[PDB]
Short mmCIF file of C-alpha atoms (C1' of nucleotides) and ligand atoms in Angstrom, two decimals:
data_model
loop_
_atom_site.label_atom_id
_atom_site.label_comp_id
_atom_site.label_asym_id
_atom_site.label_seq_id
_atom_site.Cartn_x
_atom_site.Cartn_y
_atom_site.Cartn_z
CA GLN A 11 -56.03 77.67 -54.44
CA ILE A 12 -59.48 77.87 -52.90
CA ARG A 13 -58.04 80.22 -50.28
CA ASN A 14 -57.20 82.65 -53.10
CA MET A 15 -60.62 82.18 -54.73
CA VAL A 16 -62.86 82.82 -51.73
CA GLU A 17 -63.18 84.80 -48.50
CA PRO A 18 -62.99 81.96 -45.92
CA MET A 19 -65.74 82.19 -43.35
CA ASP A 20 -65.28 82.65 -39.62
CA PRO A 21 -64.93 79.34 -37.72
CA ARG A 22 -67.87 80.29 -35.48
CA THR A 23 -69.94 81.01 -38.59
CA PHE A 24 -69.12 77.53 -39.90
CA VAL A 25 -69.71 75.55 -36.70
CA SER A 26 -72.99 77.28 -35.86
CA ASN A 27 -74.41 76.99 -39.39
CA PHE A 28 -73.19 73.50 -40.33
CA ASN A 29 -73.91 71.66 -37.06
CA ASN A 30 -75.91 68.66 -38.25
CA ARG A 31 -78.43 68.26 -35.44
CA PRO A 32 -81.49 67.35 -37.58
CA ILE A 33 -83.87 69.65 -35.68
CA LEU A 34 -82.09 72.97 -35.24
CA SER A 35 -83.93 76.23 -34.58
CA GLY A 36 -82.78 79.83 -34.72
CA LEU A 37 -80.80 79.73 -38.00
CA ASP A 38 -81.80 82.68 -40.18
CA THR A 39 -79.41 81.93 -43.08
CA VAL A 40 -78.51 79.24 -45.64
CA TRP A 41 -74.81 78.84 -46.49
CA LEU A 42 -73.50 77.29 -49.70
CA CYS A 43 -69.84 76.50 -50.40
CA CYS A 44 -69.13 75.45 -53.97
CA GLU A 45 -66.38 74.28 -56.28
CA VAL A 46 -66.48 74.25 -60.08
CA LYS A 47 -64.27 71.57 -61.62
CA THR A 48 -63.55 70.03 -65.01
CA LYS A 49 -64.49 66.44 -65.82
CA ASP A 50 -61.12 65.52 -64.31
CA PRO A 51 -61.76 66.01 -60.58
CA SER A 52 -58.36 65.52 -58.95
CA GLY A 53 -56.78 68.84 -59.90
CA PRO A 54 -57.59 72.11 -58.16
CA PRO A 55 -60.98 73.62 -58.95
CA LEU A 56 -61.44 76.17 -61.70
CA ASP A 57 -63.21 78.42 -59.18
CA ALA A 58 -64.78 78.31 -55.74
CA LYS A 59 -67.29 80.55 -54.01
CA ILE A 60 -69.22 80.98 -50.76
CA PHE A 61 -72.84 82.13 -51.06
CA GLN A 62 -75.23 83.02 -48.27
CA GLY A 63 -78.84 84.08 -48.15
CA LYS A 64 -81.56 84.67 -45.57
CA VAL A 65 -84.15 81.89 -45.50
CA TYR A 66 -86.97 84.48 -45.35
CA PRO A 67 -88.63 86.34 -47.01
CA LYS A 68 -87.72 85.45 -50.63
CA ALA A 69 -86.20 82.27 -52.07
CA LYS A 70 -84.79 84.31 -54.95
CA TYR A 71 -82.01 85.44 -52.57
CA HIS A 72 -81.30 81.94 -51.28
CA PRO A 73 -77.68 80.96 -52.03
CA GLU A 74 -78.81 78.38 -54.63
CA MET A 75 -80.24 81.18 -56.80
CA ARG A 76 -77.21 83.39 -56.17
CA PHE A 77 -75.07 80.49 -57.38
CA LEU A 78 -77.12 80.06 -60.56
CA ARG A 79 -76.83 83.76 -61.41
CA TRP A 80 -73.07 83.89 -60.70
CA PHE A 81 -72.41 80.63 -62.58
CA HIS A 82 -74.26 81.84 -65.66
CA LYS A 83 -72.06 84.95 -65.93
CA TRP A 84 -68.91 82.99 -65.00
CA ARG A 85 -69.53 80.54 -67.85
CA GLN A 86 -69.72 83.41 -70.32
CA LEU A 87 -66.22 84.52 -69.30
CA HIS A 88 -64.61 81.07 -69.63
CA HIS A 89 -64.07 78.64 -72.49
CA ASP A 90 -66.92 76.14 -72.66
CA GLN A 91 -66.30 72.61 -71.37
CA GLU A 92 -68.02 70.04 -69.19
CA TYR A 93 -68.27 71.00 -65.51
CA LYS A 94 -68.69 68.99 -62.33
CA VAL A 95 -69.99 71.22 -59.53
CA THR A 96 -70.00 70.36 -55.81
CA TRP A 97 -72.05 72.15 -53.12
CA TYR A 98 -71.75 71.95 -49.33
CA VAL A 99 -75.05 73.51 -48.14
CA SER A 100 -76.17 74.08 -44.55
CA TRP A 101 -79.88 73.46 -45.26
CA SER A 102 -81.15 71.27 -48.10
CA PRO A 103 -83.04 73.10 -50.88
CA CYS A 104 -86.47 74.54 -50.38
CA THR A 105 -89.13 73.64 -52.91
CA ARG A 106 -88.54 76.72 -55.08
CA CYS A 107 -84.76 76.31 -55.26
CA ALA A 108 -85.01 72.56 -55.86
CA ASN A 109 -87.26 73.19 -58.87
CA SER A 110 -85.11 76.01 -60.30
CA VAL A 111 -81.95 73.90 -60.02
CA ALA A 112 -83.76 70.87 -61.43
CA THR A 113 -84.87 72.96 -64.42
CA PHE A 114 -81.35 74.30 -64.93
CA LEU A 115 -79.75 70.85 -64.70
CA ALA A 116 -82.39 69.23 -66.91
CA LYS A 117 -81.79 71.68 -69.78
CA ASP A 118 -77.96 71.67 -69.61
CA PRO A 119 -76.22 68.33 -70.29
CA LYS A 120 -72.74 69.81 -69.77
CA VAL A 121 -73.19 70.41 -66.01
CA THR A 122 -73.20 67.72 -63.31
CA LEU A 123 -74.02 68.69 -59.74
CA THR A 124 -73.46 67.01 -56.37
CA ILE A 125 -75.10 68.52 -53.27
CA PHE A 126 -73.89 67.53 -49.80
CA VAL A 127 -76.32 68.80 -47.14
CA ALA A 128 -75.62 69.32 -43.45
CA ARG A 129 -79.31 69.21 -42.46
CA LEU A 130 -82.58 68.25 -44.19
CA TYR A 131 -84.91 71.27 -44.36
CA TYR A 132 -88.56 70.34 -43.62
CA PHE A 133 -87.85 66.71 -44.45
CA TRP A 134 -91.27 65.64 -43.06
CA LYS A 135 -93.30 67.87 -45.40
CA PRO A 136 -94.55 66.22 -48.60
CA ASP A 137 -93.90 69.33 -50.71
CA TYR A 138 -90.23 69.36 -49.73
CA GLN A 139 -89.89 65.60 -50.18
CA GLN A 140 -91.32 65.83 -53.70
CA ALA A 141 -89.07 68.73 -54.67
CA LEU A 142 -85.93 66.84 -53.61
CA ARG A 143 -87.09 63.91 -55.75
CA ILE A 144 -87.59 66.28 -58.70
CA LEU A 145 -84.04 67.54 -58.16
CA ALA A 146 -82.67 63.98 -57.94
CA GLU A 147 -84.59 63.04 -61.09
CA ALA A 148 -82.92 65.89 -62.99
CA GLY A 149 -79.59 64.16 -62.18
CA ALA A 150 -78.46 65.99 -59.03
CA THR A 151 -76.56 63.70 -56.65
CA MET A 152 -77.84 64.38 -53.15
CA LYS A 153 -75.93 63.16 -50.11
CA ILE A 154 -75.65 63.92 -46.40
CA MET A 155 -72.43 65.60 -45.26
CA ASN A 156 -70.34 63.21 -43.15
CA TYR A 157 -67.13 63.78 -41.18
CA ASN A 158 -64.98 63.78 -44.35
CA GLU A 159 -67.15 66.48 -45.94
CA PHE A 160 -67.24 68.70 -42.85
CA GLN A 161 -63.46 68.29 -42.62
CA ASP A 162 -63.02 69.12 -46.30
CA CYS A 163 -65.34 72.13 -45.99
CA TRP A 164 -63.39 73.30 -42.95
CA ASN A 165 -60.06 72.96 -44.80
CA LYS A 166 -61.27 74.77 -47.94
CA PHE A 167 -63.84 77.37 -46.91
CA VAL A 168 -63.13 78.28 -43.26
CA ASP A 169 -60.52 80.56 -41.67
CA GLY A 170 -59.28 77.67 -39.52
CA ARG A 171 -55.78 79.17 -39.24
CA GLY A 172 -54.09 75.78 -39.56
CA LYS A 173 -56.10 74.22 -36.74
CA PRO A 174 -57.75 70.92 -37.74
CA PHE A 175 -61.48 70.32 -37.93
CA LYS A 176 -62.93 69.30 -34.55
CA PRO A 177 -66.19 67.30 -34.76
CA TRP A 178 -69.11 68.37 -32.60
CA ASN A 179 -70.93 65.95 -30.36
CA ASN A 180 -73.19 63.35 -32.03
CA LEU A 181 -72.03 64.18 -35.55
CA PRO A 182 -72.17 60.41 -36.43
CA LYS A 183 -75.61 59.78 -34.93
CA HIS A 184 -76.98 62.81 -36.76
CA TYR A 185 -75.43 61.62 -40.03
CA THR A 186 -76.96 58.14 -39.84
CA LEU A 187 -80.43 59.52 -39.04
CA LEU A 188 -80.27 62.01 -41.93
CA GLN A 189 -78.82 59.47 -44.34
CA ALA A 190 -81.68 57.03 -43.63
CA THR A 191 -84.20 59.89 -43.89
CA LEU A 192 -82.80 61.04 -47.25
CA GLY A 193 -82.90 57.51 -48.67
CA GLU A 194 -86.48 57.24 -47.45
CA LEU A 195 -87.69 60.43 -49.12
CA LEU A 196 -85.78 59.86 -52.37
CA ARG A 197 -87.23 56.32 -52.34
CA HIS A 198 -83.81 54.70 -52.77
CA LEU A 199 -84.17 51.10 -53.89
CA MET A 200 -81.66 48.45 -53.01
CA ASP A 201 -79.39 47.02 -55.69
CA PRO A 202 -80.77 43.64 -56.90
CA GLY A 203 -77.44 41.82 -56.57
CA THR A 204 -77.05 43.26 -53.08
CA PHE A 205 -80.51 41.97 -52.16
CA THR A 206 -79.96 38.47 -53.55
CA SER A 207 -76.52 38.12 -51.98
CA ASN A 208 -77.66 39.27 -48.55
CA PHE A 209 -81.11 37.67 -48.26
CA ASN A 210 -80.25 34.25 -49.68
CA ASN A 211 -81.11 31.96 -46.75
CA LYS A 212 -78.75 29.06 -47.48
CA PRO A 213 -76.00 28.46 -44.89
CA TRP A 214 -73.77 31.55 -44.99
CA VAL A 215 -70.24 30.98 -46.33
CA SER A 216 -68.89 34.51 -46.89
CA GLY A 217 -66.45 36.08 -44.46
CA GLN A 218 -68.53 39.29 -44.53
CA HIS A 219 -70.84 40.13 -41.64
CA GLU A 220 -73.21 42.84 -42.89
CA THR A 221 -76.90 43.31 -42.06
CA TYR A 222 -79.47 44.83 -44.42
CA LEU A 223 -82.84 45.77 -42.95
CA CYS A 224 -86.05 46.73 -44.80
CA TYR A 225 -88.80 48.42 -42.80
CA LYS A 226 -92.44 49.46 -43.14
CA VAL A 227 -95.21 50.85 -40.96
CA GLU A 228 -98.95 50.20 -40.71
CA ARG A 229 -101.66 52.01 -38.76
CA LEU A 230 -104.65 50.55 -36.94
CA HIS A 231 -107.82 51.90 -38.59
CA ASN A 232 -111.21 50.34 -37.73
CA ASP A 233 -109.63 47.15 -36.33
CA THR A 234 -107.68 46.81 -39.59
CA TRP A 235 -104.02 47.33 -40.47
CA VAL A 236 -103.67 49.94 -43.22
CA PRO A 237 -100.34 50.85 -44.88
CA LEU A 238 -98.62 54.03 -43.72
CA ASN A 239 -96.90 54.97 -46.97
CA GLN A 240 -94.60 57.56 -45.36
CA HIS A 241 -91.92 55.53 -43.54
CA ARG A 242 -90.78 52.75 -45.86
CA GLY A 243 -87.19 52.05 -46.86
CA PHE A 244 -84.05 50.13 -46.04
CA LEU A 245 -80.76 50.63 -44.22
CA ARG A 246 -77.67 48.66 -43.29
CA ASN A 247 -75.23 48.29 -40.40
CA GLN A 248 -72.57 50.96 -39.84
CA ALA A 249 -69.05 49.50 -39.78
CA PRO A 250 -66.70 50.73 -37.02
CA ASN A 251 -64.64 53.86 -37.61
CA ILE A 252 -63.07 56.18 -35.04
CA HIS A 253 -64.66 59.16 -36.84
CA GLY A 254 -68.08 57.52 -36.94
CA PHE A 255 -69.09 54.88 -34.44
CA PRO A 256 -65.86 53.47 -32.96
CA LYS A 257 -67.51 50.08 -32.32
CA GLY A 258 -70.00 50.26 -35.20
CA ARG A 259 -73.77 50.64 -35.08
CA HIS A 260 -75.76 47.55 -35.97
CA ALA A 261 -78.71 47.73 -38.37
CA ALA A 262 -81.33 47.02 -35.68
CA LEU A 263 -80.09 49.98 -33.61
CA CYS A 264 -80.11 52.32 -36.63
CA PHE A 265 -83.66 51.12 -37.27
CA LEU A 266 -84.68 51.85 -33.66
CA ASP A 267 -83.10 55.32 -33.95
CA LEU A 268 -85.55 56.21 -36.73
CA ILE A 269 -88.78 55.42 -34.90
CA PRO A 270 -88.83 58.36 -32.41
CA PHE A 271 -87.69 60.59 -35.24
CA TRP A 272 -90.87 59.74 -37.19
CA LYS A 273 -92.92 61.42 -34.42
CA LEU A 274 -95.73 58.87 -34.56
CA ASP A 275 -98.90 60.05 -32.85
CA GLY A 276 -100.88 58.16 -30.19
CA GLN A 277 -102.57 55.72 -32.58
CA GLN A 278 -101.59 52.06 -32.73
CA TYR A 279 -98.76 51.23 -35.13
CA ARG A 280 -97.26 47.98 -36.40
CA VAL A 281 -93.62 48.42 -37.45
CA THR A 282 -92.21 45.53 -39.49
CA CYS A 283 -88.56 44.93 -40.35
CA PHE A 284 -87.11 42.35 -42.76
CA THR A 285 -83.52 41.85 -41.68
CA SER A 286 -80.94 39.65 -43.38
CA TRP A 287 -79.53 38.53 -40.00
CA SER A 288 -81.57 38.09 -36.83
CA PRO A 289 -80.41 40.55 -34.15
CA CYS A 290 -77.48 39.73 -31.88
CA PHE A 291 -78.02 39.78 -28.12
CA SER A 292 -77.20 43.48 -27.73
CA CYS A 293 -79.55 44.46 -30.58
CA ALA A 294 -82.44 42.33 -29.29
CA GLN A 295 -81.95 43.77 -25.80
CA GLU A 296 -82.28 47.31 -27.13
CA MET A 297 -85.27 46.22 -29.20
CA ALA A 298 -86.82 44.73 -26.06
CA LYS A 299 -86.19 48.00 -24.21
CA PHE A 300 -87.93 49.93 -26.98
CA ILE A 301 -91.04 47.72 -27.04
CA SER A 302 -91.42 48.12 -23.28
CA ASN A 303 -91.39 51.94 -23.49
CA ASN A 304 -93.51 52.30 -26.69
CA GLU A 305 -96.67 50.27 -26.27
CA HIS A 306 -98.50 51.89 -29.19
CA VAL A 307 -95.85 50.19 -31.40
CA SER A 308 -96.23 46.52 -32.34
CA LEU A 309 -92.84 45.28 -33.57
CA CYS A 310 -92.60 42.47 -36.15
CA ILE A 311 -89.20 40.98 -37.05
CA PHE A 312 -88.70 38.75 -40.08
CA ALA A 313 -85.18 37.37 -40.48
CA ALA A 314 -83.55 35.69 -43.48
CA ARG A 315 -80.98 33.82 -41.36
CA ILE A 316 -80.31 33.26 -37.66
CA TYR A 317 -77.13 34.99 -36.49
CA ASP A 318 -75.14 33.08 -33.85
CA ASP A 319 -73.20 35.83 -32.05
CA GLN A 320 -71.10 33.30 -30.05
CA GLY A 321 -72.93 34.69 -27.02
CA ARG A 322 -76.45 35.13 -25.67
CA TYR A 323 -78.36 35.52 -28.96
CA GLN A 324 -80.80 32.72 -28.05
CA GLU A 325 -81.75 34.45 -24.79
CA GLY A 326 -82.02 37.76 -26.65
CA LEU A 327 -84.50 36.27 -29.10
CA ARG A 328 -86.46 34.67 -26.26
CA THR A 329 -86.60 37.95 -24.34
CA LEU A 330 -87.74 39.80 -27.48
CA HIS A 331 -90.55 37.30 -28.13
CA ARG A 332 -91.83 37.36 -24.55
CA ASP A 333 -91.92 41.18 -24.49
CA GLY A 334 -94.32 41.01 -27.43
CA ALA A 335 -92.27 41.16 -30.62
CA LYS A 336 -93.38 38.79 -33.35
CA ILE A 337 -90.25 36.98 -34.58
CA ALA A 338 -90.38 34.75 -37.64
CA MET A 339 -88.04 33.45 -40.31
CA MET A 340 -88.61 34.85 -43.78
CA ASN A 341 -90.52 32.51 -46.11
CA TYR A 342 -91.07 32.80 -49.87
CA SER A 343 -93.84 35.40 -49.51
CA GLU A 344 -91.63 37.75 -47.48
CA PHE A 345 -88.67 37.43 -49.85
CA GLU A 346 -90.98 38.12 -52.80
CA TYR A 347 -92.52 41.09 -50.98
CA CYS A 348 -89.12 42.66 -50.29
CA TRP A 349 -87.99 42.10 -53.87
CA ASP A 350 -91.19 43.73 -55.14
CA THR A 351 -91.10 46.62 -52.61
CA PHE A 352 -87.52 47.56 -51.68
CA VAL A 353 -85.39 46.41 -54.64
CA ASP A 354 -84.49 48.22 -57.87
CA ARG A 355 -85.92 45.34 -59.90
CA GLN A 356 -86.64 47.30 -63.12
CA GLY A 357 -89.94 45.46 -63.49
CA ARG A 358 -88.29 42.02 -63.28
CA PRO A 359 -90.16 39.50 -61.09
CA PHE A 360 -88.78 37.70 -58.06
CA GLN A 361 -86.58 34.76 -59.11
CA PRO A 362 -86.16 32.53 -56.03
CA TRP A 363 -82.77 31.00 -55.32
CA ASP A 364 -82.33 27.23 -55.07
CA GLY A 365 -83.59 25.66 -51.85
CA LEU A 366 -85.44 28.76 -50.60
CA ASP A 367 -88.38 26.84 -49.13
CA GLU A 368 -86.24 24.06 -47.66
CA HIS A 369 -83.85 26.49 -45.94
CA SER A 370 -86.81 28.54 -44.60
CA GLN A 371 -88.29 25.34 -43.17
CA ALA A 372 -85.06 24.31 -41.44
CA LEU A 373 -84.50 27.82 -40.07
CA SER A 374 -88.11 28.06 -38.88
CA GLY A 375 -87.67 24.81 -36.93
CA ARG A 376 -84.45 26.15 -35.41
CA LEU A 377 -86.19 29.40 -34.43
CA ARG A 378 -89.10 27.40 -32.96
CA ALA A 379 -86.61 25.42 -30.85
CA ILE A 380 -84.89 28.60 -29.61
CA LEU A 381 -88.15 30.22 -28.52
CA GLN A 382 -89.32 27.12 -26.63
CA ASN A 383 -86.12 26.41 -24.69
"C1'" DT B 1 -84.73 72.82 -30.62
"C1'" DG B 2 -90.25 69.47 -35.82
"C1'" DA B 3 -87.49 75.16 -36.97
"C1'" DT B 4 -91.97 82.75 -40.12
ZN1 ZN C 1 -84.45 78.02 -51.48
ZN1 ZN C 2 -76.54 43.35 -33.37
#
DNA sequence: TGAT
C-alpha cells in the first residue's frame, strides 16, 4: 500500500500547497506525488513517492528532476516492463522541467505519463505556454486536478488520519478557469463529430442539452480590428454535481469568467463567441451585467440555434442587444470559420450539413422578430 | 495574491 511506500505529508502541508487558487503568492516549494503502475492500472501501484523542491534557485532540484533521477535508478532494480506513471503536482512544470521530461518521454516508448496540476505556473508567459505544448507533444497527458484528484491525493499521500478530504472554498470555480486556460494554451481542438453534432442548426431532436462555445478576441489598432492570437479556444457547459457546481455552470458564464482573468489592458477589445445555443435568460442577464461594467469590451454573440428556456429568454436577448451586444444567428461563413479555426479537422475542409442556409435564414428571421418585439 |  501507498501508505507503506511513502511518508504521508502533513495535512497542513497538503492544503496550503495544493490549494488551486490560480494566482497564489508566497509558495516557495513545488510538491509532486507520484505512482508507478503497470499497463494494468486497477491493481495497487508498483511504487509511490513524494518529491519536493524549492522553486528557486535551480530547476535541477525541482521535484520533476528528482523524480527522473529516482525513477532511472528504480528501473534498474526492477524487471523491465511498460509503465504508466501518474503525477499530482502543486505547480505545473517550468520551462526547464517541461523540456527535460519531454526529452525523457520522447526517447522512451515504454513509459506513459499523466500529470495532474493543482495550479498553472506562469500560464500567461509565452515561454511557459510553449514548454507545456512541447511536453504534451512528447505524449504527456496534462490535466487540471479536480475534486476527485484532490480527494485521491488526500487519501494516498496525506496523513489524514481517517478524516475525509474537505474541499476548500471555490475549488470548482478555480478548476473551470484553469481547465479552460490549459485547453487554450495547449491549443485543444474540438472533436469534429462533436462540432457537427452540436452546431448543426436544424431543429434540435436530441434529449441532450449541452452548450459548446468558441471564443476569440480582437484589438482596435488604427481604427481597425486586428486578431489577438492569445485568447482563442472553446469550452462547454458544466453539468451539475454537488462536488462541482450544484446547479451547473452554463457555457456563457464560464466564458464570462475567463475575460477578467485575461487581464486585458485599457485598449478597445472585441470579444466574439460562437455558441451552439443562444444564452438562456440568466446567462444573457449576466452577459448584460458584464457589458455594462466593461466598456472597453465589445461583445459579439453568434448562435447556431435559439434556446427557448421556457422562461424569459426573449427578454434576455432583447436586453443584451440594447446594452450593446451584437447578436446574430450563425450563417455558413461562421460555421466554416469555426470548423477551420476550432475543430480538429486534420486538413479536411468544411462539409456543410443539409439545409444549413435555409435553417440559418429561418432562425435569423426568428431572432429578428425577437429583437423587435 | 499575475506570484525572485
Ligand atoms: Zn521545474
Ligand atoms: Zn444559460
